[PDB]
Structures are given as structure tokens and as C-alpha cells.
Ligand binder design. Structure first.
Ligand SMILES: COc1cc2c(cc1OC)[C@H](Cc1c[nH]c3ccccc13)N(C=O)CC2
Ligand SMILES: COc1cc2c(cc1OC)[C@H](Cc1c[nH]c3ccccc13)N(C=O)CC2
Ligand SMILES: [Mg+2]
Ligand SMILES: [Mg+2]
Ligand SMILES: [Mg+2]
Ligand SMILES: [Zn+2]
Ligand SMILES: [Zn+2]
Lengths: 320, 324
């Protein structure tokens, strides 16, 4: 409680003790961290959001993250939110984003995985799930996360946007949808190609982004970087995230094995190589993304990129 | 009554089928009887081992999920798009181009393409914060819903008309049907037309004179545009059919506009019954949407569609003549 507030002073820092915060807050890290960031950024006054409404929505949203899902739960959501919060403060992006864009990114991060069942889009498609039937096999989870996140605003005393105009609401809604849909990993390559294009064409004084298309692309990549930030965190945090994602993957592979389905990559507990998978994850996905991001905001991401490279070196050394 | 119905269904291969008569003669089952006729005409029940009782049960359930109280986006419209697609599939320039599975996908897509349509636009559903727009994140709201319903109904009792397809066949058909129905969203029309024009300008024809389509992207693009053209085919039909479609779309538009007016919203284009110009709206629809599309389709299959294009141009002249 007093240690809880002590831990929350590192809210602007990469490496926040999120698991400690989750424990101290009574499994409410999403709520407390979101509340802290909103205060820190003066968003409640800027958007005239009533404190009780905020808390009420946050707790309801946090309740819709599954507590029996090892990785895609409220701790992950809190982590992405806080990570986004830090990336938004990158010096190279000063004066780029409007206040509504900042609120959109943070809100998008909070709801980006809500009601995740702990199985992949491909699993949902292959089991002819109700979700895949509703969403026609296209960004199935991500469409559902958005629909739940927005539907919860309609609950009693949960409309945190009640004092925004209809136009501001309509603009925020579009931005949030665009950002969350971009967290679908099947979109990673296209996103990264666009981020690369922007880096080669970049104008700076600090980054100068005149049109909406470029600005949303940056926000999309930012939240995607935040979603894929575990290997860039201090190793003690990273290893906990690896344990959780492997537990979730293995539970999926157990359901697949029981059903007689082909077991998804990295999901077979009888045949896994956790460490080799992490090095390959970093080499082919996480480092290309964060290296391109670091170029965009050169040199503000340096410490983050240094940690990622230290962690890749350590995981490689655990392979005999 | 059944004799006359049968007589009328002999015209199923013809542009200008008496679809409103068939709707009455069949007891408001035009979608069921026209789909059944086309499946028999194309031997699809035999090819895909579809039990006839399963086909009829699914068709009647699908048809039930069109709204009988919506003036335009109802089972008659669905039946019309199905039949129009069936005629377009038979164009000489496409002989032996598409597989039986692709033919099945295009016809099935047409049948389900507007199922459970509430008679209001995507923009109306978004602006009124509807449950549908909340479910689908404001993106192809209606068309995603039409797909979800059309596929879900296959799971009802004795409704799985695809029960004897292989797994790979079902997977391929599902993807093609989704790609086709999503392309009926009018917000995709400009890009879709732009693409079709690019294909026309670079088209390859085989030694028999038919279209050469040797990759999924080009194949699905043709089927997408084919169904879109069928969806936008009312002004290409004989005038007595076209005028009835215009009467119906304007009733539906006016009812949406009444809802908008009551709610204080800006009335959508063509939806104000106090400030409507039905004739000018048809000429604009043809000039900026329907003729650009059909002239490009006619170019793709040249000269197969020349009579259809000639009718479109005659109907544009007629509507224009009513203005002065
Ligand atoms: C801590 O480590 C991880 C964390 C996460 C993943 C993988 C990790 O480690 C291999 C995967 C990423 C992913 C999606 N498709 C893929 C295909 C190949 C490789 C990775 C992925 N995630 C979700 O499912 C995000 C979190
Ligand atoms: C018979 O006449 C019609 C039939 C149809 C439409 C318009 C017609 O006549 C103006 C509209 C086309 C349309 C969609 N958004 C638009 C925006 C502007 C103009 C047209 C459209 N449809 C559905 O909504 C399809 C059927
Ligand atoms: Mg996700
Ligand atoms: Mg009905
Ligand atoms: Mg439609
Ligand atoms: Zn996530
Ligand atoms: Zn239609």
C-alpha cells in the first residue's frame, strides 16, 4: 500500500515492477496503473472524466481479463499500457501527437486483449468457434477485444468518454479500432514495412508527421512494440513473461492434442525448446521491429535496444 | 399455379427473368425456387452430393432470415442477385474458366449476401451506435453480419448443404464466399473498380479466346466484381423491372430518412421524402457508379455483355428524359 505507491513512482520508467504491483494491488494492476497514468498525464481534467467513472470502468474492464489465462491477462494489459505510456514520451516524438491521440493509444492498450481465451486466432478458426464464425476468420480475437472494450462503456457509471463531444468520440473510436486491429500478429510484416518506409523518408527538426496516415501508422507500431516488449525488459521480468507465454501455449497444445489436432508451433510441452524459441523470436520478430523503431526515434530507444540485445545474448548462452 | 411457375422458371438463364412474378407464384419463395432450379441446371446436387431435402431445408431457412417487411433488401433481391450471377457465370468469355467449387461459391455468396438486412445503411448503423456496429467495429458492418448469418444457418437441423465436401473444399469455399460478400460493401466499390480496370488493361486471353486467370488473386477478383455487378444490376434490366426496383429502394431510403429526421440527424442522401428527386438520383447513380462498373465488366468479357450495356444506356436515357 505504501510500498504499492512506492512502486508506482517508476511509472515513467521502462522496467516497472508490474508483477509486484499486481500482487500489492490485490490483482488490480490494470486499474491502478491506468489511474496513475491518467493522473500523471492530466487526462481526467483534460477530458473531464469523473474519477468514480474511471475507476468503475477500469475495474469492470479488468474483470473481463481472464484470471486463469497465464499470459493474456490483466497483468499483460497493464504492462502494455505502461509501456505505451513510456514510448509516447520518447523525446523524438515530442510535439507529434495530439492529446486525443494520446488518450486513444492508452485506452487501446488497456483494452487490446480483453476477454482473451488463451488460444490463438488459428485455433479459433480450426475449431469452428463461435468467435471465428462471428468475425469471418479475420482478426477474430482483435475484433472481439474491441467489441468488449467498447461495450463495457455502456455499463452503469462506466462511460469515461461522457464529456467528450460526439466528434471527439467518433475520432477516438476510429483511432482505437485502427490501433487494436494492428495488434494482430498476422499484420506484423506489413506494419514493419511501413515503419521502415517512414524511417527512410523521415523528416525531423524531432519527428515531423503531417498527415493522419503517418501518425496512425506510428501509433499502431508503437502499441505493437509495447505488445512485443517483453524481451526488451530487465531479464527478471522477461523470464517471468516467457514462463507465462509457454504455459499458455502448452495449455493450447494440450487441448489440441486431446482433440487430435496438429499441435501449434511452440505449443508441445513434450517437444519444446523454450530458449531456442526465444532467440528465434528475438532474431526474426522483436529485434527487427525494435531496431526499426530505434531508428525512427534515434537515439532515444537506445537503452531499450541495449536491454533486448543483452537478453538475447543471455538466452543464447543457456543453449548448450 | 405450379404450372405457370414452372413455365416462368424456364427463363432462369435469361437476363430479365420475371422475378417478381416468380416471387408471387412461388408463395414468396423466389430465393428457394430459383436457387433450386439453378442447382439442378448446373448439376450441383450431383457434383457435390447435396441431398435435395437438405438443400430445400437450408434454402427455406435462409430465405426466412431475409426480412419480409423490408422493401428492397429482401428475399426477392437475393433471388435476383443469384440469378443474375448465374447468367454472368455463363458468359462465353468465361467458358471452362472456373471450377465447380468456384461456381458454387459465387452462387452461394449471392444467395446469402444480404441476409438479415435491416433496411438501413452501414452509416446509419454506425451513427446510431447500433449493436451491429459495436460488434463489427464500424467495418463492413452489414456484410460481416450477412456472412455470419449465412454460415451459421448451415448448422441448423438438416441444413448443411456442404456436408459431403472435403475439408479442403469447405475451407476453400468458405474463404471465397467471405471474400466475395465483403466486396459487396459499397465503401469498397472505387478500389474494386480501379482494380478491375487495371485487369482489363492487362488482360490475357487463352487460345480458345477465354480469360486467362492463373492465380487466386485474379480469380477471386473476377468473382468479386461479378457478384458486385449483379448486386448493381437493376438499371441494366428491362425497364419494367428496373422501375420496380427503384420504387422499392426509394421506399427503403425514405423510411431510413424518416428515422434520421426524427432523431435530429442530418438526412442521408436520397432519403428525404420532402426533398427527393428520384429521377435525378437514378441518372446520377448510373453515371457515377453503375455505368462505370458495367462498361468495365463489358470490356473484360467483350463483346458478351453488349446487350446488357445497351439496356443500361437506354434506361439512363429514359430516366433523364423524365427530368426536363
Ligand atoms: C515472451 O515470449 C513470447 C511472447 C509472445 C509471443 C511469443 C513469445 O515467445 C516465442 C507471441 C508472438 C507470436 C505470435 N505469432 C508468432 C509466431 C512465431 C513466433 C512468435 C509469435 N504472442 C502471442 O501469441 C505475443 C507474446
Ligand atoms: C435501384 O436504385 C438503387 C439501388 C441501390 C442503391 C441506390 C439506388 O438508386 C440510387 C444503393 C447504392 C448506394 C449505396 N450507397 C450509395 C451512396 C450514394 C448513391 C448510391 C448508393 N444500394 C444500397 O444502398 C444498392 C441498391
Ligand atoms: Mg492480442
Ligand atoms: Mg424473414
Ligand atoms: Mg449488401
Ligand atoms: Zn497483447
Ligand atoms: Zn445486395
Amino acid at each position: 500500500e505504501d510500498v504499492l505507491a512506492k512502486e508506482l513512482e517508476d511509472v515513467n520508467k521502462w522496467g516497472l515492477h508490474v508483477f509486484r504491483i499486481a500482487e500489492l494491488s490485490g490483482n488490480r494492476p490494470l486499474t491502478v496503473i491506468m489511474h496513475t497514468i491518467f493522473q500523471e498525464r492530466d487526462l481526467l481534467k483534460t477530458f473531464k472524466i469523473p474519477v468514480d467513472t474511471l475507476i468503475t470502468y477500469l475495474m469492470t474492464l479488468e474483470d473481463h481479463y481472464h484470471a486463469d489465462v497465464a499470459y493474456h491477462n490483466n497483468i499483460h494489459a497493464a504492462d502494455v499500457v505502461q509501456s505505451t505510456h513510456v514510448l509516447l514520451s520518447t523525446p523524438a516524438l515530442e510535439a507529434v501527437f495530439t492529446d486525443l491521440e494520446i488518450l486513444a493509444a492508452i485506452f487501446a492498450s488497456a483494452i487490446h486483449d480483453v476477454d482473451h481465451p488463451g488460444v490463438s486466432n488459428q485455433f479459433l478458426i480450426n475449431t469452428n468457434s463461435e468467435l471465428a464464425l462471428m468475425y469471418n476468420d479475420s482478426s477474430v480475437l482483435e475484433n472481439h477485444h474491441l467489441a468488449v472494450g467498447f461495450k463495457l462503456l455502456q455499463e452503469e457509471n462506466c462511460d469515461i468518454f461522457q464529456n467528450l463531444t460526439k466528434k471527439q468520440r467518433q475520432s477516438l473510436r476510429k483511432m482505437v479500432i485502427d490501433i487494436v486491429l494492428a495488434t494482430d500478429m498476422s499484420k506484423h510484416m506489413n506494419l514493419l514495412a511501413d515503419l521502415k518506409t517512414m524511417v527512410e523518408t523521415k523528416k525531423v527538426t524531432v519527428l515531423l508527421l503531417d498527415n493522419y496516415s503517418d501518425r496512425i501508422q506510428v501509433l499502431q507500431n508503437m502499441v505493437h512494440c509495447a505488445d512485443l516488449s517483453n524481451p526488451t525488459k530487465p531479464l527478471q521480468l522477461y523470464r517471468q513473461w516467457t514462463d507465462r507465454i509457454m504455459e499458455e501455449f502448452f495449455r493450447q497444445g494440450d487441448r489440441e492434442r486431446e482433440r487430435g489436432m496438429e499441435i501449434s508451433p511452440m505449443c508441445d510441452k513434450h517437444n519444446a525448446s523454450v530458449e531456442k524459441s526465444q532467440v528465434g523470436f528475438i532474431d526474426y520478430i522483436v529485434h527487427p521491429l525494435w531496431e526499426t523503431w530505434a531508428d525512427l526515434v534515434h537515439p532515444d530507444a537506445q537503452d531499450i535496444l541495449d536491454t533486448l540485445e543483452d537478453n538475447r545474448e543471455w538466452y543464447q548462452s543457456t543453449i548448450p
